[PDB]
Write a protein that binds this ligand. Structure first.
Ligand SMILES: OC[C@H]1O[C@@H](n2cnc3c(NCCCc4ccc(O)cc4)ncnc32)[C@H](O)[C@@H]1O
Ligand SMILES: [K+]
Ligand SMILES: [K+]
Length: 546
DNA sequence: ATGGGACTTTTTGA
DNA sequence: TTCAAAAAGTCCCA
């Protein structure tokens, strides 16, 4: 329930917000953490504030009440007017109160601005100069549905559909930041590209100036946590600048403690830096260097079609309980199942470039079982072994599905045809032509070509360009980075891939047919396939003028 | 034990 | 009626 932010990142975020504060002009800064926990950020804020006041104590004494501004009074002043925290966990608040009280070694009742509450519901009675911290991340499966009602009603500007709780914390932080204030947080990176983050990105862009984005990509910032992180720093300062510093990591294998500070890491060869004009951000944030932007714009301008224009996309089967319906093709229980009910079944690891592995699994398409008396053996001995769990699926509880039916069986005829399949998460482009009427779960996506576009594009040509090094780089420019060496390959981005057709079409298609032919024979030569791929990459680069 | 690698279900809002 | 998105992933080992 409580996650420990690495100290190097905590110090960086606090320094980012407070390093240029003019304590003489404003000796009453309000610094807030609305998910403060045990005080990872607030205790560091205390240290930064204490040095800031002590360094200028005589200037404050001369300018202001000379009896109020003494070194002995800094501790009381910081806790009365400067440090604010909120968290739902009262045990964490109690520990943090002890820590803040123990910074100075009662006199009279020092009051500490710590609130045990839901930060998304609190009536915040003033705004803040500086806001730092690490909000909770809770996705759509793990968030309580009753709470989702409240979020959908009151945070609809950033929270719909499959959005995340931390979207709302971005909203709350922005709303209670003072004019001219600065905020700096570490959150998941996914909202930068994800479809769910579209409204949140619009909210950030139009309400704050984004100073800086640190993107750690798939690096493991939180030990033993499967999440990918970024640091955002933003302000509400009236400026004409509108330019963002982007620091994007180059090696995801780095360990965060290479230097004493994060700034040393950011300036090093481990990161690349570039600038993005916030005014030029569309609903998508394309955060790339000038070389990649030129590369991306060339391809976009050259291609007159998208996959969406020419193809029909669909997600795979969702049985709702795979162990009930998926069997090994050598399982003796398949003797009980008439072959009309059986489909070939593949996983994402079975998709290679250009062709699919031979399937080892079979799907019982139980939707075609008419009733429980004709095929009782299949229900009693195979599917019924998981009947309790099958009955807890949403559509079974509501009576839409029989307990033995697939939850989302889709349309059989979409799968039983020539089509292209690709894994939903992969390190690289792997688009394959399926010749074997393979079915799959939602870890594999499929598309087929519209009939009116068959004379312009063939499957062989499509897998040729889509598997090229050019298109691998092109897709990853805007793709959603999930974890180390993993991108989402989902239709909401895959179908936006733009394609071209020019004088090189026939030779690209012929090279693709050679590759497929080699990949499908027995005494397979790996090597010549690579040479043919290099030749095709040259044709594609020639076509797109790169 | 931890940190790194292989691999990916079904719940859920719309 | 029925689509497709979602990693504080999950799980294993040396
Ligand atoms: O995880 C990092 C830190 O964030 C703290 N924190 C988590 N959620 C909140 C919150 N509102 C959101 C409430 C979400 C919720 C709703 C219903 C329910 O049944 C259970 C939870 N407001 C303030 N602090 C919060 C957390 O204690 C921890 O120290
Ligand atoms: K004075
Ligand atoms: K990661």
């Amino acid at each position: 329930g409580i996650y420990y932010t690495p100290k190097i990142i905590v110090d960086y975020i606090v320094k980012k917000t407070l390093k240029n504060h003019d304590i003489i002009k404003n000796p009453y800064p309000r610094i807030l953490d609305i998910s403060c926990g045990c005080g990872n950020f607030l205790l560091e804020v205390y240290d930064i504030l204490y040095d800031l006041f002590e360094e200028n104590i005589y200037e404050l004494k001369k300018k202001y009440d000379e009896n109020y501004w003494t070194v002995d009074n800094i501790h009381r002043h910081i806790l009365n007017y400067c440090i604010y925290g909120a968290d739902i966990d009262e045990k964490a608040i109690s520990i943090l109160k002890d820590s803040l009280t123990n910074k100075k070694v009662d006199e009279s009742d020092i009051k500490i601005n710590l609130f045990c509450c839901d930060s998304l519901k609190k009536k915040w009675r003033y705004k803040f100069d500086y806001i730092v911290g690490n909000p909770p991340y809770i996705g759509h499966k793990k968030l309580e549905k009753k709470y989702k009602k409240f979020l959908l009603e009151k945070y609809s500007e950033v929270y719909k559909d499959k959005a995340d709780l931390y979207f709302c914390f971005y909203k709350k932080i922005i709303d209670i930041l003072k004019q001219g204030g600065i905020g700096s947080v570490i959150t998941p990176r996914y909202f930068l590209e994800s479809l769910s983050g579209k409204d949140l990105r619009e909210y950030i862009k139009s309400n704050v100036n984004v100073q800086e984005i640190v993107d750690f990509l798939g690096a493991n910032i939180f030990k033993n946590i499967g999440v990918s992180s970024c640091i955002l720093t933003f302000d509400k300062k009236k400026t004409k600048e509108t330019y963002i510093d982007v620091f994007k990591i180059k090696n995801e294998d780095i360990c965060i403690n290479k230097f004493e500070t994060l700034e040393e890491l950011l300036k090093s060869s481990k990161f690349e830096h570039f600038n993005i004009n916030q005014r030029l951000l569309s609903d998508e944030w394309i955060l790339v260097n000038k070389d990649d932007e030129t590369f991306y714009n060339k391809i976009q301008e050259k291609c007159k079609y998208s996959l969406e224009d020419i193809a029909i996309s669909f997600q795979g089967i969702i049985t709702g309980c795979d162990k009930a319906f998926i069997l090994s093709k050598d399982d003796v229980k398949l003797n009980l199942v008439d072959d009309k009910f059986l489909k070939c079944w593949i996983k994402s690891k079975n998709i290679n470039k250009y062709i699919v592995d031979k399937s080892e699994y079979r799907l019982i398409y139980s939707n075609d079982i008419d009733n429980e008396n004709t095929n009782k053996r299949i229900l009693d001995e195979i599917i019924g072994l998981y009947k309790t769990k099958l009955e807890n699926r949403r559509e079974c509880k509501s009576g839409i599905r029989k307990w033995y039916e697939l939850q989302w069986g889709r349309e059989k005829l979409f799968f039983e045809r020539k089509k292209i399949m690709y894994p939903y998460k992969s390190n690289e482009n792997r688009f394959a032509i399926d010749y074997d009427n393979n079915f799959s779960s939602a870890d594999v996506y499929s598309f087929f070509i519209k009939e009116e576009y068959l004379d312009k594009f063939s499957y062989e040509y499509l897998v040729g360009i889509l598997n090229s090094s050019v298109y691998d780089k092109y897709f990853k420019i805007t793709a959603k980075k999930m974890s180390k060496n993993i991108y989402d390959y989902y239709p909401n981005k895959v179908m936006k891939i733009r394609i071209f057709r020019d004088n090189n079409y026939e030779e690209i298609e012929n090279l693709s047919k050679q590759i497929i032919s080699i990949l499908l024979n027995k005494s397979i030569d790996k090597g010549k396939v690579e040479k043919l791929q290099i030749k095709m990459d040259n044709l594609i680069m020639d076509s797109l003028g790169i």
